[model samples]
Target chain A: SMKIDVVTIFPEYLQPVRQSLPGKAIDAGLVDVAVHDLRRWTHDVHKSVDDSPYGGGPGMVMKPTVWGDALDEICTSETLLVVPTPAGYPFTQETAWQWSTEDHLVIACGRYEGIDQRVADDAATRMRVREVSIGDYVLNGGEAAALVIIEAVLRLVPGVLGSLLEGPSYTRPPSWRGMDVPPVLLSGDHAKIAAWRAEQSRQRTIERRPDLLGFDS
Target chain B: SMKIDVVTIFPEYLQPVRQSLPGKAIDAGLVDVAVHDLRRWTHDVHKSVDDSPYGGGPGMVMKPTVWGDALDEICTSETLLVVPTPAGYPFTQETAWQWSTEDHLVIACGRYEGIDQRVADDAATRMRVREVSIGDYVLNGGEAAALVIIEAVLRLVPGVLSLLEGPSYTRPPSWRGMDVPPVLLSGDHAKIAAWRAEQSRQRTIERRPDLL
Candidate 1:
């Protein structure tokens, strides 16, 4: 079993995590999840979590004090601090596999410009800190990116089974809307079907995601 | 304004979209969204939407008839069919920018194995069809991936403004827990501060995310 906590300003943004497959795992005692409102630790009248950047910028930066307090209270000595930031390292299936082996994880969702640089720097002393980006694109905040990372990582836990880029799938509908199921699929010969599917999978990988092929040329 | 529909087995998985900024836009009539259940269009007593994949395999494939009916009723000629799959082309900021200009979008969430191949092949003749993967990793299904794509694409529409990898940010804390604000950020001279920030940005970009 694993313990997971997500700290976010928009706590409701993570409700989907509770309604999806991960939630089922939580109910079955396979995992434990708790969503916390980052504002809970604020001391100001406004409970403000952000302010203008020290270096001057177009967006606001999340205050270090608030994040420090929230993380200090929620994270254990063994907890891994996962920060989702566009400026961080790209997260991949390999990252998820490694994380699934951890005993605990505390994901700090950075919104607005991003969390104060000192938060991650300070947290790194007591625990391993990984600043990850779900992809090259950015979102209004890290909440959506958090959801992407959480879903990706949690599914790799013992009970979950999932895939990379699977080839196209076809069900019974030998013919439809002027398109016919590739004859090889309907041929009922296991060897030929598997061979044809392998080639189709390779061709699709080449056409759409050549980057996955790792070709230097 | 843009119209978007998402068909999935877990409609509740999308409840977050309605509570966030996108919901605010929906209330303002800047966007119209509807979440439909794929089982709604099924005829079986079980209302089954999937069957074992053809040509023999480990997982089941979504039934073409269920998907065909659901999509036929939901998609218009102007709609762009966005299917989230691990096998599809990667979705990027550039893809978001292009999709934001469209009048309508219908994102079909694929679970189990995936939707029948013919669905997209058939839809392409009548409308634009894009099979997009959010990143290199796999998800339990396309529902979460759909959320990622929807959030990515919708925020790019006229009223939305966001960013790519930005340099680190520091606020009022001139110091914190053994870490001090870089002296340049506190120097008060805008020219020196901006110059230092730019250098730090480039260096950090190089160190942590050479890919970005």
Candidate 2:
């Protein structure tokens, strides 16, 4: 079994985990998850979690102290600290496969300009730390990225979804709005069907995602 | 104003939209959003939304008629049908910026083997259609991608969060045994900008040298 913890200001944003595949995993005892409110560690009256950027920028920066306190309390020694940030490395299926093998994951969700850089740097001394970006685009906060990462990683855990991705899928109504399901799919020949599915997937990958085909550029 | 309608089997997966910036955008009247359960259009007793793949497969495929009816009823002539699929085109900041300017968006969130391909093909003849993948990784379904895309694009909507992109640091330059790089505190505009630029460049090469 794998354990995952998510720390965020808006724990509500992480609520979907309880409703989808992740929830099913939790119920099956294959995965354990806990969402923490970052403000819980704040000592101030307002439970303020961010401050104006030290370098002078448009948005606030998540306070390092609060994050440090939160993680220090939430993480076990075996934990891998995953910080979701745009500047981090690209998160891919390969990363998901690797992370799924880990014993524990504590994802720190950041907002505003982002959590202070020192949080990851500080956490690095005590545990494994990986800053990951779900995609090239920016989000309102790491809550979304954390949810995505958790879903991606958990589904890879054994017994979760019975395992995973591929080609364009079609079902029923051989014809719809004048469009018909490819004839190969309707063919009764099973071996030819597999061959056609493979070819279709190969052609679609080459045409739409050459990079996934191992093209460097 | 921009309008967005998301169709999904797991509508709860999209609840985040109501708690964050997208919710604020709606309250401010700059964007409108409605999430519909795909089963709503089903005539079956189970309100079934999926069927076995036409070709041999390990999992079921989202049914065509269900999605067809959902989109046909929800979409307007000006709508852009955005389908989230692992096999589709990459979704990036550029896509978000371009999508923010649109009048209507209907995001079809696919689960199982994913909604029938013909949904996109059929929607194309009546409206613009774009299939976008959030990244190289796969998720349980498109609800997450729809949430990510909605947040990314809606933030770009004028008066939303008022911005996009990048790292940040804060006060208490010396905290938890770590110090802010001296350059940030120098108070010299040129030096600070240069320092930030150099740090950003270093990060780019460190994490994403391909951009260079």
Candidate 3:
């Protein structure tokens, strides 16, 4: 079973994770998911996990100490650590696929302003540290982004889905009706489905996120 | 006070709203926020709120019935119904101010593929309907976008904030950090505060010109 550990100030925010689709996977022994409250590791009377940015900025920055200890204690050699932030790499289907292949996944959800850069850098030394962004906008916290990633990735874990037919098809792209599901999805031809997904991936990359296309001429 | 009614499939997802900054506004009577489970309006045995898209598609689309009735029952003449989608106008500081001025704001948070367009279009006639996008990328649901908007707008309502500061001065194109302290922030001298705020606004606009 794949394992996921989430670090967030509001551990209760993950209630939906344990009650909804992801929970189904865990109940069936196909996955294991746990939510950790970052405050639990703090020794301060107030249990504060954030401090002012060194540069004299507005809004509080998450303290590096809490994150450093949390990662060291919770993470394993097989764990893939994902840091969700606005400045991180845009999360995509490819990133989701990579996380699903790992035996364990550790997600650090930042709050208030953002996390200390040092914590992110230090965590990278031991595990795969990926900065993932759900979208281009800013969120009050990273819980929402972490949820999106979990929902998307967990669905891909083998045996987690109830049925192959009922499971979500990650290959589909945006479609019509203000939607954009890939055309190959409806073709009913398996070969065409693969071809269509690849083409749509490139098309989606070019149309919506050309930066992912890289600098190849 | 501003009123916001949210129709969501997963009502529990909104629990954070009550504990965060918006909850404080509600407790102080500066804002009235109500969250309704969309399943309550569904008549099916499973209370299914989603169905296969009209045309063949990969993901399920939210049925119009659930959203239609939820909005119909919750909304009034003073209510402004907002649908948060990537197709909508990008959420901005100006948009928050516009929403704060309204007496009521109704948000329909959609999931799966998305909500049927008819629900959004039909709700637009009685109440002001706005499609708002927080950013360029896609999310699994619209709940996050709704929270972002609500947080931005709720802080703008008069007396909602504990400090005299407004959300605008602390947001993009004004402050450098993810948040900015209100210009008239108490304790500081008026002239110095004003000068610093002016510099911050200029610096913000210069660095993030797209916000302008």
Best by TM-score: 2
Q: Per-residue CA lDDT of candidate 2, range B1-212, in tens?
A: 88889988788777667545445566778877788988899979989888888867777788888888898899988999999988788899999999999999999988736788888888898899998889988887888889899999988988775112345678788887888888777889888887778777778877887788
Which residue pairs in model 3 clash with each other? A173-A180, A174-A180, A174-A181, A175-A179, A175-A180, A175-A181, B88-B131, B170-B180
TM-score (chain A) of candidate 3? 0.75
Per-model clash counts, in order, read 0, 0, 8
User: Residue by residue across B1-212, what tens digits does model 1's lDDT show?
Assistant: 88889999899988778556444576677887679988899989999989888788787899989998999999989999999888888888889888888889999998736899888888888999999888878787888888877777877887643223444556554556444446545557777555665665675666454443
Q: Assess the local accuracy of residue B197 in candidate 1 as a C-alpha lDDT between 0 and 100.
A: 59
Evaluated on the second chain alone, the candidates' TM-scores are 0.85, 0.91, 0.75
Instruction: Note each model's CA RMSD in angstroms.
Output: 2.6, 2.6, 9.7
Model 3 per-residue lDDT at A177? 32
Clashing pairs in 2: none
lDDT of 1 by residue, A1-217 (tens): 8988999998988888886777787877877888999999999899999988765657788888899899889987798999987677778889989998899989998888788878888898889998887876767777777777777788888876533246888888688877888898888898898888888888888888876787432
lDDT score for residue A94 of model 2? 92
Candidate 3, lDDT over the whole model:
0.67
> B139, model 1: CA deviation in Å?
0.2
DockQ numbers for every candidate?
Answer: 0.64, 0.69, 0.10
Residue-level lDDT of model 3, residues A32-143, one tens digit each, is: 8889999888898999887664424478777776777888899976678898775565576667666778898898998887876667666767777887666544556788
- What fraction of the native alpha-carbon contacts across the interface, defined at 8 angstroms, is recovered by model 2? 0.87
True contacts kept of each: 0.76, 0.87, 0.05
Ranking by DockQ: 2, 1, 3
lDDT of 2 by residue, A1-217 (tens): 8889899988887888887788899999998898998888988798998889876878688888998899999987789999998888989889999999999999999888788888888888899999988998988899889889988988898788551235677788888888888898888789988887788788877777777678653
- Candidates, ranked, TM-score: 2, 1, 3
